[PDB]
Amino acid sequence: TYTTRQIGAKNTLEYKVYIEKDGKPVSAFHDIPLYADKENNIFNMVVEIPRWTNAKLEITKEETLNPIIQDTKKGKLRFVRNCFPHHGYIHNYGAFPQTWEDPNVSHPETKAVGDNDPIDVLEIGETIAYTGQVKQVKALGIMALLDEGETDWKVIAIDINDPLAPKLNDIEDVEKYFPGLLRATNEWFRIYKIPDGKPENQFAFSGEAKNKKYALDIIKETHDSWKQLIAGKSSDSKGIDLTNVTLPDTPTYSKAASDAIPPASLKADAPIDKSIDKWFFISG
């Protein structure tokens, strides 16, 4: 069973969420299996950001066991801004564990290096998720975002427990049951950092949402990149903390790391500056 261990108050620099397996912290990057059911194409998603929120929570690469923390810019807590007509993130947003967008090779599909993280996942179901949740999802397709000039694929997925899951099998089904969502997704990822002063992003394939099989192929490639990474065989692991508690044949296996995590110290959410309310009316 997977649960969460929260340290501190949400919306603070001290906030951390660790994932626990049967009560013991494990690495959110390395120790949660990619596959919940490999041959039925059912994946474990680690949720970072609930739909319609702003705090830019991420699995952190550089802390032991890779807890989810809030990203920062210029020493400050990062919040993604509201871009009309969207409120925060328009998906439950997270990642697949045991994957890596390899920054050390140019990816041919996109002609750009990877962004150095777990492959990203957009979960489209009705219920709002929680940070650190491990949920089981089916892949429906994938979009090739070039985010600040780096390969940053976005998998389109649904929770297998969603009432609609049985009716969603491939990417065309997304348009059928969620009409306009894929177009809004393309817009969101193009424009969301314009309020921060960044350029508009771009997609490969003129923004096409590639199908389920394409998605599976890219997921599997990023899983192979991770296999090399966790074996200690990347040419440059970028300072990622490869400590894990479930992979005893890897060089960075450590039983002790789980017990060194402090106990939960969950505090009430901290306030968020009112500026985060603002609705930006921007576009590329």
Residues annotated within the binding site for diphosphate are: 78
Minimum gap (Å) between residue 274 Cβ and a second copy: 6
Is residue 278 close enough to count as binding a second copy by CB under 8 A?
Answer: yes
Task: Judge whether 154 and 189 are in contact, CB under 8 Å.
Answer: yes
Which of the ranges 4-12, 192-200, 255-263, 270-278 carries the binding residues for a second copy, by CB under 8 A? Answer: 270-278
Choosing from 93, 178, 203, 226, the residue that interacts with a second copy (CB under 8 A) is 178
Enumerate the known binding-site residues: 78, 115, 120, 152
Q: Where are the alpha helices (DSSP H) in the chain?
A: 171-177, 181-191, 212-230, 256-259
Sign of CA pseudo-dihedral 145, 16, 255, 93: negative
Minimum gap (Å) between residue 177 Cβ and Mn ion: 25
The item of a second copy, Mn ion, none sharing an interface with residue 130, based on CB under 5 to 8 Å by kind, is: none
**Does 35 qualify as catalytic in the annotation?**
no
Which of residues 5 and 86 has its CB atom nearest to a second copy in the complex?
86
Is residue 267 close enough to count as binding a second copy by CB under 8 A?
Answer: no
- Region class of 111: left (phi > 0), else alpha (psi between -120 and 50), else beta: left
Which of residues 117 and 162 has its CB atom nearest to Mn ion in the complex?
117
Query: Which residues on neighbouring strands pair with residue 19, listed in sequence order?
Result: 4, 26
Is residue 90 close enough to count as binding a second copy by CB under 8 A?
Answer: yes
Identify the residue whose tokens are 């929570």.
57
Task: Judge whether 247 and 30 are in contact, CB under 8 Å.
Answer: yes
Task: Judge whether 145 and 155 are in contact, CB under 8 Å.
Answer: no
Choosing from 130, 177, 232, 262, the residue that interacts with a second copy (CB under 8 A) is 177
Which of the ranges 59-67, 97-105, 122-130, 136-144 carries the binding residues for a second copy, by CB under 8 A? Answer: 122-130
Is residue 281 close enough to count as binding a second copy by CB under 8 A?
Answer: yes
Is residue 87 close enough to count as binding a second copy by CB under 8 A?
Answer: yes
From the candidates 89, 93, 192, 214, which is the catalytic residue?
89
Is residue 166 close enough to count as binding a second copy by CB under 8 A?
Answer: no
116, 170, 127, 93: CA torsion to nearest 10: 10
* Residues in 79-138 at the binding interface with Mn ion, rule: CB under 5 A: 115, 117, 120
Enumerate the known binding-site residues for Mg(2+): 115, 120, 152
Choosing from 33, 38, 85, 172, the residue that interacts with a second copy (CB under 8 A) is 85
Choosing from 128, 130, 169, 260, the residue that interacts with a second copy (CB under 8 A) is 128
Task: Judge whether 135 and 47 are in contact, CB under 8 Å.
Answer: yes
Which of residues 92 and 99 has its CB atom nearest to a second copy in the complex?
92
Is residue 274 close enough to count as binding a second copy by CB under 8 A?
Answer: yes
> DSSP states of 119-187 as a string?
PEEEE--SS---TT-EEEEEEEEEE-EEETTEE--EEEEEETTSTTGGG--SHHHHHHHSTTHHHHHHH
User: What's the gap between Cα 212 and its chain centre?
Assistant: 18
Residue 133 backbone phi and psi in degrees, to 5: -60, 140
Task: Judge whether 161 and 191 are in contact, CB under 8 Å.
Answer: no
Is residue 144 close enough to count as binding a second copy by CB under 8 A?
Answer: no
Question: In this structure, what DSSP letter does residue 46 have?
Answer: E
Q: Which residues bind a second copy (CB under 8 A)?
A: 51-52, 84-87, 90, 126-128, 177-181, 184, 274, 277-279, 281, 283
Residues classed as catalytic: 89
